[PDB]
Structure 1
């Protein structure tokens, strides 16, 4: 192509330019907004915590969210503004999706970190979709989303609530130790790290509970100094969820906060929403079968769910109707006998009709049992025995008169 139009804009090409048809379809999909989409939950699920938990100044929260931003970011943005050196590994063409040499599809939300600073925000969140060209397996995929967050602080406030003897210039000419920026102070550092570590420890528990195995491991980031990587154990093996550290000053000073300090952090909604929901193969996140997108109904974000596998095989539906016996009979009783008699491979049951006979005045119910194996395709003959093993069981043990 001579050019490529993405969002009311067309971009030239070159040996950098490498966007595939496949990938491209996705862009603008903005999944972290399909409301009842796991990814979105984690957004308010996280948007909320911060709303309640923090509010600097009056009733205006300090963490102002941005959930709809242009993935198509310049280059200076995604790399340069974050002090990322030239020829740095992560600038490999076969890792990033470039439109042209100077414009690409943000590899990380950390790309906006600079603009927002410059602007005026001193505290914010950015939830979006990002791309990274790579494999496609259980835990990796062309496209995913990130929730990034950032907070700054005032020199007369970082400390403040301290034995008010202001002999604490939030930063000097020291030196970069594996523990602080050459232009930072231990007291200042140790604090925000606490806040950053703090805010995060707090935020996690809120989401997961307080029975989560979590630790910090030291790491590296071109745009943060003390860098830590929050990992979370579950299933027996420790998994990872985010990246964070204080903010690199140069980065800040360059922007519009020559006299401030702060921390940044961005997490992977797929990662979180995967443990928090027991969805194993990231890919599923792009499934459309009701059997999926719905498992995440709930009238409350903070509510919890536990992914039901979901077999991609022919289902074999049968119906069973019976007249109800007076006085004793509750729905959940019949839902268990089904799940008891030939259960384990039922997937779903629905009440498809409540008929109150006009003359006998006896009630009838019609349940729709959706048989469906997870490994093979089930035959009518294989099933029926099960269904039948419920017709002569539903009677005896439930006290119904079987319309069959």
Structure 2
């Protein structure tokens, strides 16, 4: 006779993670499961690690105050997580298998672009690495990430740090989702890696772009407002 109904439970329930965090975890997991080490570095970087080491000449437009946040003449807020891959190449000799997630900064912002954002960069440096190896890696990553056996397109592009280079498209009639390329000989040479003995490939992707594709997020500005009405949707 001590009957009761099925009202809600008592107390505190779970909150949740930020959609970018979920996305970074997921990207890391695709590579950490196959031997990639997670590498981190400082957000306040120097000219050498951020540009020079990456075959970006002193007169290159990316270095300008119209795109890069500066503290002084040589100190800046990193424009990419590529400096982390540089610090790794200096610290050790090949093989290198790393993924570099992190906060990155760009001056030229408004809508479609934020002054701060997240990206994951990859690097593999070994004895006989090819562009075929790179294609395989990227195509399988994207299928794993988007949980579909989708079509992957490689379009020739350019980067100072890679040669050859590609912009990577996926269907939905195509969408550009990331870039990659074979590490430039000068990039290796600069970090004491012999381009005759070692080959390598690198890749880059924006976490917010990926999260937006995955979760159907329309406005990129929702990511930094931290409205509970936004956040709650990713529990």
1:271 CA drift (Å): 0.8
1:72 CA drift (Å): 0.4
Which of 134, 139, 154 is residue 108 of structure 2 equivalent to?
134
Aligned to 2:63: 91
2:76 alignment partner, SS class? strand
Q: How many residues align?
A: 216
Instruction: Output the TM-score relative to the length of structure 1.
Output: 0.51
1:254 CA drift (Å): 2.5
Which of 249, 255, 265 is residue 203 of structure 2 equivalent to?
265
Structure ranking higher on relative contact order (CA contacts 8 Å, 6+ apart) = 2
2:215 alignment partner, SS class? coil
Determine the C-alpha separation between the residues in 2 that align with 1:48 and 1:125.
Answer: 10
Determine the C-alpha separation between the residues in 2 that align with 1:111 and 1:51.
Answer: 20
Determine the C-alpha separation between the residues in 2 that align with 1:254 and 1:51.
Answer: 27
Determine the C-alpha separation between the residues in 2 that align with 1:278 and 1:202.
Answer: 22
Matching of residue 193 in structure 1 with residue 131 in structure 2: yes
1:136 CA drift (Å): 1.2
Mapping for residues 141-152 of structure 1, pairs under 5 Å: 141-152=114-125
Mapping for residues 167-316 of structure 1, pairs under 5 Å: 192-210=130-148, 212-234=150-172, 236=173, 238-258=174-194, 259-297=197-235
1:87 alignment partner, SS class? coil
> In the alignment, is the contact (CA less than 8 A) between 1:130 and 1:143 conserved in 2?
yes
Aligned to 1:16: none
2:157 alignment partner, SS class? strand
Q: Where do 5+ consecutive residues of structure 1 fail to align?
A: 1-34, 55-60, 159-190, 298-404
Aligned to 2:51: 79
Aligned to 1:64: 37
Determine the C-alpha separation between the residues in 2 that align with 1:44 and 1:289.
Answer: 22
Determine the C-alpha separation between the residues in 1 that align with 2:183 and 2:150.
Answer: 27
What's the C-alpha RMSD, in Å, of the aligned pairs? 1.7
Aligned to 1:46: 27
1:246 alignment partner, SS class? strand
> In the alignment, is the contact (CA less than 8 A) between 1:72 and 1:103 conserved in 2?
yes
